[PDB]
Structure 1
C-alpha cells in the first residue's frame, strides 16, 4: 500500500544542542535539523528495499521540540534535559545508554503518538560514541524501533516506548561535520527500521575503500566521502524490507 509510506518522527533538541549547535538561536537549530532530516529522507526514499520498485519509503518530521533551557529537577531526580550529566556529573556527557533510556522514559507520552522519536544532543560521549538506537523488527510484538508498542518499565511504573534513538554532534571536543552528522542519524534510524550492523568477514556488505567503502550500517562512522557511505547494504535491505513490509500498515502515514 504505497500510501502509508512515511514514518513521521518527533525530533527533539535538548538544551545543549540549542546552545552549542544552534548557538542559542531558534532558527539556526530548527534549520539545522530540518536540513539534516531532509538529507536522511533523501537516502531512504530513493532506496529500493528489494532492488526493484519497493521504494519511496521515508522519514518526515511531524514536530520539532527545542528545549531552550535545561530542565529544572528537584534534588534526587533526573531528566534527559537537565543541566548536569548522569551518572557522573564531572563528565561532559551522560552515559550514552543511560541517556537514551531516560529520554525514552520522559518522552513516553509523546513518543506513543509517533512512528519514531529522536533526540539530538551535543555532548562528548566516551570513546567517540556518536549515537545509538533500539533495533526495529517485523515481529508482531516488537518493542523497539518503528511503531510505538508499549513496554512496561518495572522501575518506571509506567508504559514507555522504545521507538527511539539519539545523535550527538559533538566528539572529542569538536563539532562533527554535517556530512558525518547526517550519516550518524541515517544509521541510528536504520536500526529503528530493523537493520543490524553490516558484518565483516562476509564483507559483501562491508566493502573496502577500493570498492566504495562501507555502507551506512557499518558501526565505524569514519568519513562520508566514499560512494557506499550514503547507501544501505544488501544486508540492511533484506533486514529493513521485512520490517517495513510488516510495520508500515501499523504506523506509517502518507508523505508530505
Structure 2
C-alpha cells in the first residue's frame, strides 16, 4: 500500500516552452506541475478494483525544460531538433517516430523513473493528439510503466519504452486546458496498461444520456460529459492487473 506512486520524468521541448510557456521557464514549469497534478486527481481517486485499490497515481520526479532547439549535424536527428522529421515541410513530426526518438535520446534518464512523458506543441497529421506505449502485467513486458530495458543495436545502450507524449496543438490552434488534461490522462492510461475502449455490450462506451464515453475511447472525448474524465470498467480491469504486478517493481511512496 505504500508503493503507490509512479514517478515521472516530464520534458517540455522548445516548442512547448515557446508557445505554451511564453518562453518563460516559470510559466512552463507551473503549467506542467499543475496539469500533472490535475491528472493525478483522476488517477488517485480511481478504485481500480471498484473497492479499496485506490490511491495510485503520478508525481513529477524531474522536470526538464528545453529552452532552445537541439542543434543537429547533417543526417543526424534529435526529438528536440528545430525541424520536424522525416518531412521538414510539415508542422509536426510523424508521431510514432517522435515517440521512438524521444525514448532513444532520453534513455539514460528514463531508466531512472517509472515513466517519461514529452510535452510538445506541434500539429500531428490527421488529428492526432498524443501517443504512448501500452503497459502490461507480464514480467518480460516491454512498454508502459517501469523501465524494462530493450537493447539497441546502433546506440550501444538500453532503450526503455516507458514513455508517451502529449501535444497541445491540434488543427492550427492551442487545445483547451481541459482537453490537454484528457490527452495526458489517456496516454498515461496506456502506459498504465489500458487499451482503447470498445463499443457495445461491454458497458465501456456509454451514450451521452448515460454520462458519455470514458477517457480511453480512441476518439478524443470533449470533456463535457461526466464519464469523459474517468476510466471505464474495461480500462480498470487492464490497469488493475498491471498495477498489482508492477507497483512493487517501480512505484514509490507519495511525496
Could you state the TM-score of these two structures normalised by the residue count of structure 1? 0.98
What is the distance in 2 between the residues matched to 1:157 and 1:123?
30
2:197, 2:235 within 8 Å by CA — same for their partners in 1? Answer: yes
1:103 to partner: Cα distance: 0.2
- Structure 1 counterpart of 2:98: 99
CA displacement 1:61-89 (0-9 Å, x = unmatched): 00110000000111110000000000000
1:197 to partner: Cα distance: 0.3
Q: Secondary structure at the match of 2:129?
A: strand
1:201 to partner: Cα distance: 2.4
2:2, 2:252 within 8 Å by CA — same for their partners in 1? Answer: yes
2:214, 2:221 within 8 Å by CA — same for their partners in 1? Answer: no
CA displacement 1:97-146 (0-9 Å, x = unmatched): 00000000000000000000000000000011000100000001111000
CA displacement 1:190-227 (0-9 Å, x = unmatched): 00000000001235000011110110100111310100
1:156 to partner: Cα distance: 3.8
- Structure 2 counterpart of 1:54: 53
Count of residues in correspondence between the two structures? 255
1:249 to partner: Cα distance: 0.2
Q: Secondary structure at the match of 1:109?
A: helix
Does residue 142 of structure 2 align to residue 151 of structure 1? no
1:38 to partner: Cα distance: 0.3
Q: Secondary structure at the match of 1:117?
A: strand
Task: Spell out structure 1 runs of 4+ moving beyond 6 A.
Answer: none
Q: Secondary structure at the match of 2:136?
A: coil
Could you state the TM-score of these two structures normalised by the residue count of structure 2? 0.98
- Structure 1 residues without counterparts, runs of 5 or longer: none
- Structure 2 residues without counterparts, runs of 5 or longer: none
